[PDB]
Amino acid sequence: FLDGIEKAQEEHEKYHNNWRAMAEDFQIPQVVAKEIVAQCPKCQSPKTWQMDCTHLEGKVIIVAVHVASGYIEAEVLPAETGKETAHFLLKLAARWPVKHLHTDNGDNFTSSAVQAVCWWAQIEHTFSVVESMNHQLKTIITQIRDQAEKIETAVQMAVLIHNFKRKGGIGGYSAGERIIDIIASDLQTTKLQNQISKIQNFRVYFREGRDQQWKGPATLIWKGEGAVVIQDGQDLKVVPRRKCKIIKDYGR
Amino acid sequence: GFLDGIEKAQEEHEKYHNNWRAMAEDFQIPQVVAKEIVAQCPKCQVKGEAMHGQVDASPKTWQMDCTHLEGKVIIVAVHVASGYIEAEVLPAETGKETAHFLLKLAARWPVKHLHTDNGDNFTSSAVQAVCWWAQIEHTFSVPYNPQSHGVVESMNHQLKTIITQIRDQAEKIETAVQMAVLIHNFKRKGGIGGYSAGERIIDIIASDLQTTKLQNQISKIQNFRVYFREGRDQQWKGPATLIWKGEGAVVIQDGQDLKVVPRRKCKIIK
Amino acid sequence: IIASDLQTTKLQNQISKIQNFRVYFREGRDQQWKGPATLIWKGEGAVVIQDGQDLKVVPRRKCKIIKDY
Amino acid sequence: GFLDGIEKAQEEHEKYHNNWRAMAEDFQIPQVVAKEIVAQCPKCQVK
Amino acid sequence: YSAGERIIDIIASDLQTTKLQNQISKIQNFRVYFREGRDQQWKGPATL
DNA sequence: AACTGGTAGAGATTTTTCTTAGC
DNA sequence: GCTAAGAAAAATCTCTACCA
DNA sequence: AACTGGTAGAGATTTTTCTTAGC
DNA sequence: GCTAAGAAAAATCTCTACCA
Ligand SMILES: O=C(NCc1c(F)cc(F)cc1F)c1cn2c(c(O)c1=O)C(=O)N1[C@H]3CC[C@H](C3)O[C@@H]1C2
Ligand SMILES: [Cl-]
Ligand SMILES: [Mg+2]
Ligand SMILES: [Mg+2]
Ligand SMILES: [Zn+2]
Numbered sequence: 001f002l003d004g005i006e007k008a009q010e011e012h013e014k015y016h017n018n019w020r021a022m023a024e025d026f027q028i029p030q031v032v033a034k035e036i037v038a039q040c041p042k043c044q045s046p047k048t049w050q051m052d053c054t055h056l057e058g059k060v061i062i063v064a065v066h067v068a069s070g071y072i073e074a075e076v077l078p079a080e081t082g083k084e085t086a087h088f089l090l091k092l093a094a095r096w097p098v099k100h101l102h103t104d105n106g107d108n109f110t111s112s113a114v115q116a117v118c119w120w121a122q123i124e125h126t127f128s129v130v131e132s133m134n135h136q137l138k139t140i141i142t143q144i145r146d147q148a149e150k151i152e153t154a155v156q157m158a159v160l161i162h163n164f165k166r167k168g169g170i171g172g173y174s175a176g177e178r179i180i181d182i183i184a185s186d187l188q189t190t191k192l193q194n195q196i197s198k199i200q201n202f203r204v205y206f207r208e209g210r211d212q213q214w215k216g217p218a219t220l221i222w223k224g225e226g227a228v229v230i231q232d233g234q235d236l237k238v239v240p241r242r243k244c245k246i247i248k249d250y251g252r
Numbered sequence: 253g254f255l256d257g258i259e260k261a262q263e264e265h266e267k268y269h270n271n272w273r274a275m276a277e278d279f280q281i282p283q284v285v286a287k288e289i290v291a292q293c294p295k296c297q298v299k300g301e302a303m304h305g306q307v308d309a310s311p312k313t314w315q316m317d318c319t320h321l322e323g324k325v326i327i328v329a330v331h332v333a334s335g336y337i338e339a340e341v342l343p344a345e346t347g348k349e350t351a352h353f354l355l356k357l358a359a360r361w362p363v364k365h366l367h368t369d370n371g372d373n374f375t376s377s378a379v380q381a382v383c384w385w386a387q388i389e390h391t392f393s394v395p396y397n398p399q400s401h402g403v404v405e406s407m408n409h410q411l412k413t414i415i416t417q418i419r420d421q422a423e424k425i426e427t428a429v430q431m432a433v434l435i436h437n438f439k440r441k442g443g444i445g446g447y448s449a450g451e452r453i454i455d456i457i458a459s460d461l462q463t464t465k466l467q468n469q470i471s472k473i474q475n476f477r478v479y480f481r482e483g484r485d486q487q488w489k490g491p492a493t494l495i496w497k498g499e500g501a502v503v504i505q506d507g508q509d510l511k512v513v514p515r516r517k518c519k520i521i522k
Numbered sequence: 523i524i525a526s527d528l529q530t531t532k533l534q535n536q537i538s539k540i541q542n543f544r545v546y547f548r549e550g551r552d553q554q555w556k557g558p559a560t561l562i563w564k565g566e567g568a569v570v571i572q573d574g575q576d577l578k579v580v581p582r583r584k585c586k587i588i589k590d591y
Numbered sequence: 592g593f594l595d596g597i598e599k600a601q602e603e604h605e606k607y608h609n610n611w612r613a614m615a616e617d618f619q620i621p622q623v624v625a626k627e628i629v630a631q632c633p634k635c636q637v638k
Numbered sequence: 639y640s641a642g643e644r645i646i647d648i649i650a651s652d653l654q655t656t657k658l659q660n661q662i663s664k665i666q667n668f669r670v671y672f673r674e675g676r677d678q679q680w681k682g683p684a685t686l
Numbered sequence: 687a688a689c690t691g692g693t694a695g696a697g698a699t700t701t702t703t704c705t706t707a708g709c
Numbered sequence: 710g711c712t713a714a715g716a717a718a719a720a721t722c723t724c725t726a727c728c729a
Numbered sequence: 730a731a732c733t734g735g736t737a738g739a740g741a742t743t744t745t746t747c748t749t750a751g752c
Numbered sequence: 753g754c755t756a757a758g759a760a761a762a763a764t765c766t767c768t769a770c771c772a
């Protein structure tokens with residue numbers, strides 16, 4: 001156990017590993033490995049989208065793209081007012097978690113209706129990838145145009161072929177697998193951070209061997225079934241449970 | 253004896269239609285005879301068997317239905333294993349708009365199985381052509397039995413309660429529909445893992461892909477075949493693939509079927 | 523000759539006593555009870571019956587299956 | 592139903608005076624009514 | 639075979655052995671919620 | 687401040703009764 | 710003659726639809 | 730021959746956590 | 753310093769209406 005913590009600290013001092021790899025290699029819990037990463041001075045987005053409008057056959061196609069994965073959602077608009085752009089943004093924010101929207105300085109994007117939608121759904125709008133996505137979508141649309149009667153069917157068939165049928169990148173994944181893996185990794189991070197804060201609201205008085213007195217207040221990191229890991233004096237150490245007292249702390 | 257009582261009980265049931273306890277007490281026949289007299293009458297037998305079944309909950313199954321609100325037509329689709337909702341307002345209840353809603357849904361999320369009722373928009377050639385092109389299995393419920401798709405009708409109820417909660421913050425009904433979808437998907441927690449519906453659909457689909465890749469890498473380097481003895485007759489079946497050897501039993505795969513066999517009836521050969 | 527007819531009558535007795543069931547079901551928009559039909563397949567939740575040379579699927583909650591002694 | 596079996600077994604015991612296990616296996620009636628058919632005959636006895 | 643195919647095959651087989659022993663525990667770190675017969679509540683977290 | 691769901695049947699599970707073979 | 714295995718017949722327990 | 734009720738909230742009961750007095 | 757009573761806060765279990 002403590003040998004695993006010592007090997008993890010020496011290996012991070014050499015190579016600066018991440019906490020998932022250290023927890024899987026050295027067989028330590030994840031809160032301990034995250035503390036080892038968080039104590040290092042040299043070691044201290046999944047919700048950003050971009051939007052644009054374009055033209056095809058006299059129609060208006062609005063395109064939104066998830067940036068870290070390349071994931072496309074598109075639609076055909078009857079006009080280019082601010083109310084239709086606000087309805088598209090409200091549908092997108094109701095289906096995927098959107099926190100940061102990046103657009104250009106168009107007219108319909110600089111509007112009171114889009115501003116009211118961003119106020120209600122709590123999005124950060126920023127005015128200045130989508131050009132490459134418009135070119136790629138237009139090549140697929142021309143590649144499958146003879147199978148559809150209307151332009152709306154061809155647009156949605158091209159979105160399906162782009163998202164699930166084209167493979168590339170490092171491991172040969174599509175865009176849907178990449179967006180799902182990215183958001184799932186972020187969810188794991190936030191749940192572990194909630195556990196970390198709830199544990200770190202405590203305090204530990206511990207008694208070393210060959211002494212009767214209690215030492216200073218060390219902060220609890222992990223409380224197991226038979227052992228207790230504490231941080232004290234910028235040092236992580238493992239004390240048995242029969243030489244410890246854990247009390248609540250009020251130091252806000 | 254009671255054989256004359258059997259004859260009088262048959263005449264009595266032919267006139268009055270007694271239940272079995274009345275005949276078994278008034279004619280002093282055994283209860284099996286009285287139950288048979290009642291069971292051979294067609295004017296009786298008006299009662300079901302009092303149980304419920306259980307719908308399909310595979311990780312790529314969706315259910316779809318339509319509802320009405322303030323003179324409009326809403327169309328609701330639910331992901332069954334997680335509870336994830338998509339919804340829209342249709343200008344008409346035809347088959348063209350239903351085919352376009354299904355095409356957009358199949359472009360956004362992976363759909364392989366769809367369950368619907370027998371309305372005129374879901375049994376249509378446009379929805380048939382979209383399911384053919386996008387490779388979906390479309391199944392229909394038993395007619396006039398809404399319990400076969402209980403998840404989407406329960407979500408009709410939840411959507412209407414949220415819409416009445418936030419009705420005064422919007423002007424039109426399409427705005428209030430999309431605000432209700434956001435509040436259901438992301439602002440309500442509680443359930444299997446303490447998740448919301450968006451977190452649950454992310455966890456379910458990511459877990460599906462991860463576990464296929466892991467057991468592909470495990471099974472591509474396996475060995476230690478197992479010959480096992482099972483059945484009513486003590487025969488011996490051929491090459492089976494050992495998957496996991498445990499404290500008490502082993503797990504084998506035979507002809508693409510999973511089986512759990514104890515250690516006394518199997519022999520491992522490297 | 524006689525013993526073969528004894529074996530044939532025994533096997534036909536077991537075959538006839540396996541699956542001679544009657545089904546009273548309830549179907550339609552106005553859910554009325556209808557006459558006896560022949561059971562074909564019985565799964566958990568629903569059954570498939572043959573009535574008047576027509577196959578129908580009824581749930582097990584809307585049908586009664588009568589066996590023989 | 593076995594009600595026609597009860598009538599047929601009564602005719603058959605009136606001819607040949609069967610026992611009760613024979614009638615209960617041949618005519619597929621329950622054992623209580625077959626024992627009662629043997630009990631009502633003044634010449635036979637259930638054994 | 640030449641030398642490059644030999645060195646690639648050797649390191650690949652060694653990696654497959656050690657990663658097998660880790661991947662089994664990795665696949666057993668999932669949790670399953672299941673349903674038995676004629677009971678309509680989802681039973682607790684068994685292990686896959 | 688003084689009001690309110692219930693009835694009966696279809697199967698499943700547990701218990702009692704009855705015949706017969708073995709020691 | 711006494712005892713126990715096996716099966717038949719009876720008793721109890723849980724669950725469902727319909728009543729404007 | 731291959732079909733099927735479910736979702737989420739209001740209380741009641743059981744369990745875990747936290748402070749303080751007594752020996 | 754150690755132990756137990758008491759109460760607060762959290763976790764589990766049973767039951768209901770509505771969905772054309
Ligand atoms: O009675 C309904 N719901 C209430 C309810 C429930 F949801 C779940 C339950 F367990 C019990 C319930 F009483 C209901 C009725 N119908 C339709 C519905 O979708 C629907 O939900 C529907 O679409 N059709 C189309 C197909 C043929 C035509 C048009 O008649 C039917 C009527
Ligand atoms: Cl229907
Ligand atoms: Mg419907
Ligand atoms: Mg419905
Ligand atoms: Zn570092």
Ligand SMILES: [Zn+2]
Pocket residue numbers: 265269270290293294295296
């Ligand atoms: Zn009757």
Ligand SMILES: [Zn+2]
Pocket residue numbers: 604608609629632633634635
């Ligand atoms: Zn006689």
